[PDB]
Amino acid sequence: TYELSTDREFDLIAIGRACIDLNAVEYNRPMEETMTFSKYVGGSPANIVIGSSKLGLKAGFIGKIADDQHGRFIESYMRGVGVDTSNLVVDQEGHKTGLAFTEIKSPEECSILMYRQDVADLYLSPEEVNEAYIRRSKLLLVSGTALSKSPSREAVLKAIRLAKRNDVKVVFELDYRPYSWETPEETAVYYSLVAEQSDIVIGTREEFDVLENRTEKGDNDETIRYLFKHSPELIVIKHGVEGSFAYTKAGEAYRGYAYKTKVLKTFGAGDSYASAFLYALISGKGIETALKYGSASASIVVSKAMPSVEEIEALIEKDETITIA
Amino acid sequence: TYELSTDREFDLIAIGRACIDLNAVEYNRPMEETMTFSKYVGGSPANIVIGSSKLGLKAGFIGKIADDQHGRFIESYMRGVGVDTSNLVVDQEGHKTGLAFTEIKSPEECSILMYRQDVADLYLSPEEVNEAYIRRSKLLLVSGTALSKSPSREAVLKAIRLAKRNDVKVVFELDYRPYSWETPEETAVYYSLVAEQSDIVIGTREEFDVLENRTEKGDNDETIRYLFKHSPELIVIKHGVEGSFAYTKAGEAYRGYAYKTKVLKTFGAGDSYASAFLYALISGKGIETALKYGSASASIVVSKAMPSVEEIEALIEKDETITIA
Amino acid sequence: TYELSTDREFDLIAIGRACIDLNAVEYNRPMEETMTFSKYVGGSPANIVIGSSKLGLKAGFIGKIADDQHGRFIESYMRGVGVDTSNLVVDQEGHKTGLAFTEIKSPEECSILMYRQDVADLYLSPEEVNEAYIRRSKLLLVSGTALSKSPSREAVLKAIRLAKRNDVKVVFELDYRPYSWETPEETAVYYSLVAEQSDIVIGTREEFDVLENRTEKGDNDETIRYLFKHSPELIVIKHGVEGSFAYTKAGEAYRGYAYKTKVLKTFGAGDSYASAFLYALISGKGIETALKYGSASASIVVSKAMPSVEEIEALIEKDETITIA
Amino acid sequence: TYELSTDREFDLIAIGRACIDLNAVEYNRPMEETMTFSKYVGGSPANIVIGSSKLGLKAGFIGKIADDQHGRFIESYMRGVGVDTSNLVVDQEGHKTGLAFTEIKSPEECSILMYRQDVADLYLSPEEVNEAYIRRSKLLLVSGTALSKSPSREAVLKAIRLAKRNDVKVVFELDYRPYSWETPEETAVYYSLVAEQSDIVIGTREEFDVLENRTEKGDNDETIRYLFKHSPELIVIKHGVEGSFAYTKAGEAYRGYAYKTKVLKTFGAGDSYASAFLYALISGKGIETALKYGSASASIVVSKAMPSVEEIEALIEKDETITIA
């Protein structure tokens, strides 16, 4: 589709969390032994828009930030890397920015100590969601964790409605954070509802299991038979080293491959995947190639500071992928 | 439709609030001057199932009640009037039953002092919603106020999904209680979502305005043009003394009329309307006649202790309706 | 003491809860079977000031009431029985009045279903406690339940300080309501602190056990040896049918007796006891006689609508007391 | 006093907060521009016991820590510097450790972005306060911020009672953190109550103003005339560069002096003051000398990593103090 129904200024606008990541400087050790932390912007939709801007996409953001040095850093950083920050709203009720402290015990053992209670990003409200902003974009990227609590949950539902009625493609990134939710069945309720309304849904197989209210691994053919009764036209299901699979409502299926990588830290793999996959799609590369872009970007981010197009393309050309799994 | 896809034991199962109403014995005065109150079961879906049982329908209920004398009264009363109470769940966290104290200053000035914070009915959770129960019913009656807070909101969303996949007709009663919600836009978000999933939607024009996120009276033709893009096959829009209008997806429209009445107290008019309207529909009377049943029952309940079929039919035969408005 | 250090307009000012009692009309049955309830003002300090006014004392009140028909009833009723309501403050944050529904299964089995969460009376704050009001009184009556939550707890602590520095006698009524507190040790912390600051302490033996952080019945001689290291000059310890004992810092002890009574409902016994005991003390009758006044009033209130001086005195003259226990 | 009524194993046990401080590595800039933070144990009573151990005192601690890497770091660090951690209790309800991010705009402009809501240290409860532990100490150090919320507030009140009845000296460090409290009058209520029960009270003049419920600077002679009606035998009032003053119930007064210092960061000045002042007192140096120890330690901590006895003594000998203010 080489021209759209309306003129678009943004490639994507994401909605939900922009927070602080505090990354362990001394790593491959228990966090108790980590004495210094480096400050970064984090949060799945924030990471996706920052990664997208690094690839040259024009990105915007709908989210709530704290009225303090952490919120001002997040705004200044995003603006400095070329993300539009016009629709970042400053919380006026004393709410703090969420914090993720990262522990890297080894390449295979990484985890986050999260400060998530009553954080500013969860107080984004429907009245702060602007139709005039959303309609200037090709895509609306919705992250699942933004559905974990009201009023953010209703702000997201409002955003999706406004996107759909302005011919803005709704991309749902499943982004599962179990400790942000009360129960997995609660997660299933909102994930199913939102996926059914969305145009593109991207998640791991485990995340689709949650969506479907399952406690055991589901079958991709059943997943898509279900969701293709509803709005989605494209469903991307990721299986880590077993690769990734994209399915279209027209009945085609495409396969992507994990890249061989010297892993340092696995955080951010999924946000790098989404940004590069969407970049490829928006850039006319087609689904099969888009899967390589997402996979290559994921590999670079965990071994590196988000990937450049040049780094992604060099890794794709080198073509050292995993096919044995 | 004179036999269904599966055998049904219940005419309707309602989900949401069963609480205590404390009705002013000395009335036509400020509640400050009311010295005695009579105890009744209240709550919109409770009233609808109690009214339905009085008409001879077989009714069930999904709701949470307090572990105390008020909860036990509600269970015993509903059971005693022939409602199935097998899926009433007793709250084990110390939550109290909601309370409505009624003030009747005059026939034209009635209001409720409500105790609604952290009440037991709002803690109904998805894990307490049983598919095996729902599938034994012709209809699932969902009241709007049950969407006002989690976990009840997710329990209702789960119930609707289970109803739909078991060929149980979803009836959404808009039941608007503004003080149960944070903002009208929040109400619009959930009302729109739920109405779009429902088979039958019943509400006042003001309630549809809320659903549509409007602050001014909407146009019924626009309302139905919207909802008939989605699941509903029947939409009933009530306008008080100006009557009521039912619209079908096939493109038919039917009109009902308010009955002339010596009003005592307006509480319960809407629940009497829904129970008698649904009774008529279930009983094969057709939509135009069903509107008369709902209107006649509404009139009797505010002038009377829920109506009998005989009282409703006598009032319909007498045919003293309002057409001047 | 027949004239005081400053002129006094009030005999007592009480601080804490004024709420609604809903008394079962059909009684000697489970509340499930009680269909009608009569509305009264309740709450221990409210009852004490209403009872005091009925005896002819001049009483005032420091408390917070709801901005609704229940709060306005409480103000109008107290004012109508001669209590000063100038320092009742209206809650502006939507908090409801506490509610006590009374169950009378039999004379020997009475209990309350309480609505106590986030009630208006608990939001009385230090800024709403007026030194100019307190200093116009002979006595400040503090009820223990007002210490159960902030900000009421700090309002009470402020009131006590202001009383003491204006030569206003602090009377601490132990008024134990376990479900208003998180743990008994928490109750002990605040009860001990407040009793140590008070001039007169009145409670049941069980209430003093709570004060002392004991789970077994304590010894009155040990209780008073403890508290007489601190502020109290008079300690009254009640033992139901075994009578009541008052102890002075000077080392005297006095005994009172329960009155034989045809019990209907035991609620309010303690508030009737405190009001009549204080009336007798204020009226120069001395401690031994004051114990008879408290006991007689307790008997009348549970068999009856608060006692008159004439009813109390007639019962004392009749002298049908319990001495066998 | 060269031998005590009972044998003592600890010089001091402190009660309240042990948390994480995240200190700006790149400083003399807005925190937005600070990219790296170093992890330390913080919290006023924690700092006081860590500083005390560095001076060679035997210290213990009563506090609650998170069940995570931050709580385990705090325990391991305190233990590693010789503080007894036997009465650190691990929170089992998912509460996080408080966090202080430090901003150093310049030597004269330092501030903290605090994460303080529902933090683990505030859930220390009376049942977790052990009399057998407290009685093994010479002193109990109570920090004011531990009174800011229940259940910590009641745990502290319990600790003070147990200290007093075991001849353990109660030292109240006023430690004022306004954003931990609802209102200054609330702070005054608890600070006044606790100071009245304490043996030694240490605070800035501004902190005593808060204690006294004043919004303007108070007069030390009035402050001590008040508190010397109650338990204190020693009151230390600090005035920054104008020095510090200690007053005894016997009627003596002593003056201390601020040390000239190249200030880097003012955090921790007060905790260094308290630890070194108490060290001097415990070590028989007398009050006038103890004031020099507190002042010298304060100077070193803000210009430096807590002071050694040797560093403190060298600074005292050098005797470069401020007397012009």
Please give the DSSP secondary-structure letter assigned to residue A301: H
Interchain proximity D70–A22, CB inside 8 Å: no
Dihedral Cα C179, C181, C183, C188, nearest 10 deg = -120
User: Is cis: bond before B126, omega within 30 of 0?
Assistant: no
Interchain proximity C186–D150, CB inside 8 Å: yes
The CA distance from D244 to D222, in Å, is: 16
Q: Which of A181, A176, A180 minimizes the C-alpha distance to A195?
A: A176
Q: What are phi and psi of A52, to 5 degrees?
A: -60, -40
Side chain identity at residue C212, one-letter code:
E
The CA distance from B194 to B60, in Å, is: 21
Find out whether D83 and A46 touch, Cβ atoms under 8 Å. Answer: no
Interchain proximity A193–B189, CB inside 8 Å: no
- Enclosing H/E stretch for D47: helix D44-54
Q: Which of D249, D238, D248 minimizes the C-alpha distance to D287?
A: D248
Q: Touching check for C127 and chain D: CB below 8 Å?
A: yes
Side chain identity at residue D117, one-letter code:
Q
The CA distance from D174 to D197, in Å, is: 13
The CA distance from D97 to D107, in Å, is: 28
End-to-end CA distance of chain B: 35
Q: Touching check for D151 and chain C: CB below 8 Å?
A: yes
Find out whether A109 and A29 touch, Cβ atoms under 8 Å. Answer: no
Of C36, C103, C118, the CB nearest to B38: C36
C-beta neighbour count of B57 within 10 angstroms: 21
Q: Which of C209, C263, C215 minimizes the C-alpha distance to C241?
A: C263
Alpha helix ranges (H) inside chain A: 44-54, 69-80, 131-134, 152-165, 184-197, 205-211, 220-227, 269-282, 287-303, 309-318
Q: Which of C317, C268, C267, C270 minimizes the C-alpha distance to C292?
A: C317
Q: Which of C68, C23, C19, C70 minimizes the C-alpha distance to C45?
A: C19
Q: How far is CA B43 from CA B24, B97, B121, B126, B158, in A?
A: 17, 11, 10, 20, 21
Q: D: neighbours with 3+ CB pairs under 8 Å? A: A, C
Side chain identity at residue B46, one-letter code:
A
- Cα of C41 to nearest chain B Cα, Å: 11
Dihedral Cα C30, C35, C41, C47, nearest 10 deg = -30
DSSP string for residues in A31-55: GGG--EEEEEEESHHHHHHHHHHHT
CA-CA-CA-CA torsion sign (D276, D278, D283, D288): positive
Please, which residues have CB within 8 angstroms of residue B225's CB and are 6 or more apart in sequence?
none
Dihedral Cα A281, A287, A288, A292, nearest 10 deg = 40
Q: How far is CA C27 from CA B77, C19, C304, C306, in A?
A: 18, 21, 14, 19
Q: How far is CA A169 from CA A142, A160, A163, A233, D147, in A?
A: 11, 9, 7, 10, 53
Interchain proximity C193–D189, CB inside 8 Å: no
B&C contacts, CB < 8 Å = 60
Q: What are phi and psi of D22, to 5 degrees?
A: -115, 100
Q: Do chains C and D touch (3 or more CB pairs under 8 A)?
A: yes
C-beta neighbour count of C33 within 10 angstroms: 15
Q: Which of D310, D288, D178 minimizes the C-alpha distance to D243?
A: D288
Which chain D residues are within 8 Å of A25, Cβ to Cβ? 36
Token pair in block for residue A276: 């590069």
Q: What are phi and psi of C295, to 5 degrees?
A: -65, -45
The CA distance from D222 to C165, in Å, is: 16
Q: Touching check for B222 and chain A: CB below 8 Å?
A: no
Token pair in block for residue C170: 């602090």
Paired with A36 in beta bridges are D38
Q: Touching check for B118 and chain C: CB below 8 Å?
A: yes
Q: Do chains D and A touch (3 or more CB pairs under 8 A)?
A: yes
Q: How many residues does chain A have?
A: 325
Q: Is D264 helix (H, G, I), strand (E, B) or coil?
A: coil
The CA distance from B88 to B18, in Å, is: 9
Dihedral Cα A302, A303, A307, A311, nearest 10 deg = -140
The CA distance from B249 to B228, in Å, is: 6
Paired with D61 in beta bridges are D14
Find out whether C183 and C215 touch, Cβ atoms under 8 Å. Answer: no
Paired with D62 in beta bridges are D15
Find out whether C208 and C174 touch, Cβ atoms under 8 Å. Answer: yes
Token pair in block for residue C212: 């002392």
Q: Do chains A and B touch (3 or more CB pairs under 8 A)?
A: yes
CA-CA-CA-CA torsion sign (A55, A56, A62, A67): positive
Dihedral Cα C40, C43, C46, C52, nearest 10 deg = 90
Please give the DSSP secondary-structure letter assigned to residue A168: P
- Cα of B86 to nearest chain C Cα, Å: 19
Distance of alpha carbon B134 from its chain centroid, rounded?
A: 17
Place of tokens 């001091």: D12
The CA distance from A9 to A87, in Å, is: 15
Q: Which of C204, C142, C151 minimizes the C-alpha distance to C178?
A: C204
Q: Touching check for D184 and chain C: CB below 8 Å?
A: no
Q: Touching check for B78 and chain C: CB below 8 Å?
A: no
Radius of gyration of chain B (CA): 18
The CA distance from A273 to A292, in Å, is: 9
Q: A: neighbours with 3+ CB pairs under 8 Å? A: B, D
Q: Which residues of D212-249 are buried (b: 16+ CB within 10 A; e: fewer)?
A: bbeeeebebeebbebbbeebbebbbbbbeeebbbbbeb
Token pair in block for residue D4: 């005590």
The CA distance from A123 to D49, in Å, is: 39
The CA distance from A112 to A22, in Å, is: 9
Token pair in block for residue C321: 């007391």
Find out whether C211 and C192 touch, Cβ atoms under 8 Å. Answer: yes
The CA distance from A239 to A46, in Å, is: 23
The CA distance from A137 to B33, in Å, is: 60
CB contacts under 8 A, A 258-297 vs B, are none
Instruction: Spell out the CATH class of D18-43+97-113.
Output: mainly beta
Instruction: Report the alpha-carbon angle D141-D142-D146, nearest 5.
Output: 145
Query: Would you list the domain boundaries of chain A?
Result: 9-17+44-96+115-325, 18-43+97-113
- Cα of A126 to nearest chain B Cα, Å: 7
Parallel/antiparallel/unpaired status of strands B169-173 and C59-65: unpaired
Find out whether A206 and A223 touch, Cβ atoms under 8 Å. Answer: no
Interchain proximity A189–B157, CB inside 8 Å: yes
Token pair in block for residue B223: 């309302």
CA nearest A182 in B: which residue? B151
Instruction: Report the alpha-carbon angle D171-D172-D177, nearest 5.
Output: 150
Long-range contacts of B250-258 (CB under 8 A, 24+ apart): B252/B287, B254/B287, B254/B288, B254/B291, B255/B288, B255/B291, B256/B288, B256/B291, B256/B292, B256/B294, B256/B295, B257/B291, B257/B292, B257/B295, B257/B321, B257/B322, B257/B323, B258/B295, B258/B298, B258/B299, B258/B321, B258/B322, B258/B325
The dihedral region occupied by B16, where left means phi > 0, alpha psi between -120 and 50, and beta the remainder, is left
The experimental technique used to determine this model is: X-ray
Interchain proximity B39–C34, CB inside 8 Å: yes
Q: Which residues of B86-115 are buried (b: 16+ CB within 10 A; e: fewer)?
A: ebbbebeeebbbbbbbbbbeebeebebbbb
The CA distance from B22 to B37, in Å, is: 5
Q: Which residues of B16-35 are buried (b: 16+ CB within 10 A; e: fewer)?
A: bbbbbbbbbeebeeebbebe
The CA distance from C51 to C164, in Å, is: 24
Q: How far is CA B64 from CA A96, B53, D282, in A?
A: 35, 20, 62
Q: Touching check for D117 and chain A: CB below 8 Å?
A: yes
Q: Is B299 helix (H, G, I), strand (E, B) or coil?
A: helix
Instruction: Report the alpha-carbon angle D134-D136-D141, nearest 5.
Output: 45
The dihedral region occupied by A6, where left means phi > 0, alpha psi between -120 and 50, and beta the remainder, is beta
Please, which residues have CB within 8 angstroms of residue D277's CB and are 6 or more apart in sequence?
D202, D236, D290, D291, D293, D294, D297
Maximum Cα–Cα distance for chain A, whole Å?
Answer: 55
Instruction: Report the alpha-carbon angle C118-C121-C127, nearest 5.
Output: 110
Token pair in block for residue B228: 């008939």
Please, which residues have CB within 8 angstroms of residue D191's CB and are 6 or more apart in sequence?
D144, D147, D174, D207, D210, D211
The CA distance from D285 to A26, in Å, is: 44
The CA distance from B186 to B191, in Å, is: 9
Interchain proximity C39–B37, CB inside 8 Å: yes
Q: How many residues does chain C have?
A: 325
Q: Touching check for D186 and chain C: CB below 8 Å?
A: yes
Interchain proximity D31–A69, CB inside 8 Å: yes
CA nearest A179 in D: which residue? D94
Token pair in block for residue A258: 């994990």
Please, which residues have CB within 8 angstroms of residue C80's CB and are 6 or more apart in sequence?
none
The CA distance from B71 to B90, in Å, is: 8
C-beta neighbour count of C77 within 10 angstroms: 18
Instruction: Report the alpha-carbon angle D81-D83-D89, nearest 5.
Output: 125
DSSP string for residues in A127-147: GG--HHHHTTEEEEEEEGGGG
SS3 for B172-221 is EECCCCHHHCCCHHHHHHHHHHHHHHCCEEEEEHHHHHHHCCCCCCCCHH
Q: Touching check for A72 and chain D: CB below 8 Å?
A: yes
Q: Which of D76, D99, D96 minimizes the C-alpha distance to D88?
A: D76
Interchain proximity B69–C32, CB inside 8 Å: yes
The CA distance from D26 to C223, in Å, is: 61
- Cα of B167 to nearest chain C Cα, Å: 38
The CA distance from B288 to B277, in Å, is: 10
Q: Touching check for A314 and chain D: CB below 8 Å?
A: no
The CA distance from C192 to C202, in Å, is: 13
- Cα of A196 to nearest chain B Cα, Å: 12
Please give the DSSP secondary-structure letter assigned to residue A98: P
- Cα of D193 to nearest chain A Cα, Å: 30
Q: Which of A253, A254, A250 minimizes the C-alpha distance to A291?
A: A254
Q: Which of B13, B18, B73 minimizes the C-alpha distance to B44?
A: B18
Please, which residues have CB within 8 angstroms of residue D28's CB and are 6 or more apart in sequence?
D104, D105, D106, D107
CB contacts under 8 A, B 10-69 vs A, are none
Maximum Cα–Cα distance for chain D, whole Å?
Answer: 55
Find out whether C197 and C158 touch, Cβ atoms under 8 Å. Answer: no
Q: Best interface-test mutation with B: which of A130, A148, A149, A158 has the largest number of B CBs within 10 A?
A: A158
Place of tokens 């709704």: A170
Q: Which of C296, C241, C236 minimizes the C-alpha distance to C272?
A: C296
Find out whether D135 and D6 touch, Cβ atoms under 8 Å. Answer: yes
**What resolution in Å is listed for this PDB structure?**
1.9
The CA distance from A305 to A51, in Å, is: 9
CA-CA-CA-CA torsion sign (A209, A213, A217, A220): negative
Parallel/antiparallel/unpaired status of strands B109-115 and B99-106: antiparallel
Q: What are phi and psi of C313, to 5 degrees?
A: -65, -35
SS3 for D113-176 is EEECCCCHHHHCCHHHCCHHHHCCEEEEEEEHHHHCCCCHHHHHHHHHHHHHHCCCEEEEECCC
Q: Which of B175, B185, B177 minimizes the C-alpha distance to A161?
A: B185
Q: Which of D198, D222, D228 minimizes the C-alpha distance to D209?
A: D222
Find out whether A293 and A280 touch, Cβ atoms under 8 Å. Answer: yes
Q: Is B246 helix (H, G, I), strand (E, B) or coil?
A: strand
Q: Touching check for A109 and chain D: CB below 8 Å?
A: no
SS3 for chain C is CCCCCCCCCEEEEEECCCEEEEEECCCCCCHHHCCEEEEEEECHHHHHHHHHHHCCCCEEEEEEECCCHHHHHHHHHHHHCCCECCCEEECCCCCCCCEEEEEEEECCEEEEEEECCCCHHHHCCHHHCCHHHHCCEEEEEEEHHHHCCCCHHHHHHHHHHHHHHCCCEEEEECCCCHHHCCCHHHHHHHHHHHHHHCCEEEEEHHHHHHHCCCCCCCCHHHHHHHHCCCCCCEEEEECHHHCEEEEECCCCEEEECCECCCCCCCCCHHHHHHHHHHHHHHCCCCHHHHHHHHHHHHHHHHHCCCCCHHHHHHHHHHCCECCCC
Q: Touching check for C312 and chain D: CB below 8 Å?
A: no
Interchain proximity D151–C186, CB inside 8 Å: yes
CATH of domain D9-17+44-96+115-325: 3.40.1190.20
Q: Which of D142, D209, D224 minimizes the C-alpha distance to D175?
A: D142
- Cα of C69 to nearest chain B Cα, Å: 5
Find out whether D296 and D310 touch, Cβ atoms under 8 Å. Answer: no
Interchain proximity A193–B157, CB inside 8 Å: yes
Q: Best interface-test mutation with D: which of C185, C193, C194, C212 has the largest number of D CBs within 10 A?
A: C185
Q: Which residues of D10-45 are buried (b: 16+ CB within 10 A; e: fewer)?
A: bbbbbbbbbbbbbbbeebeeebbebebbebbbbbbb
Please, which residues have CB within 8 angstroms of residue D173's CB and are 6 or more apart in sequence?
D44, D45, D48, D141, D142, D143, D144, D202, D203, D270, D274
Please, which residues have CB within 8 angstroms of residue C51's CB and are 6 or more apart in sequence?
C271, C272, C274, C275, C276, C297, C306, C307
Looking at chain A, after which residues does the C atom sit over 2.5 Å from the next written N, breaking the chain?
Answer: 304
Q: How many residues does chain B have?
A: 325
Of A22, A32, A117, the CB nearest to D76: A32
Q: Which residues of C277-295 are buried (b: 16+ CB within 10 A; e: fewer)?
A: bbbbbbbeeebebbbbbbb
- Enclosing H/E stretch for A253: strand A253-256
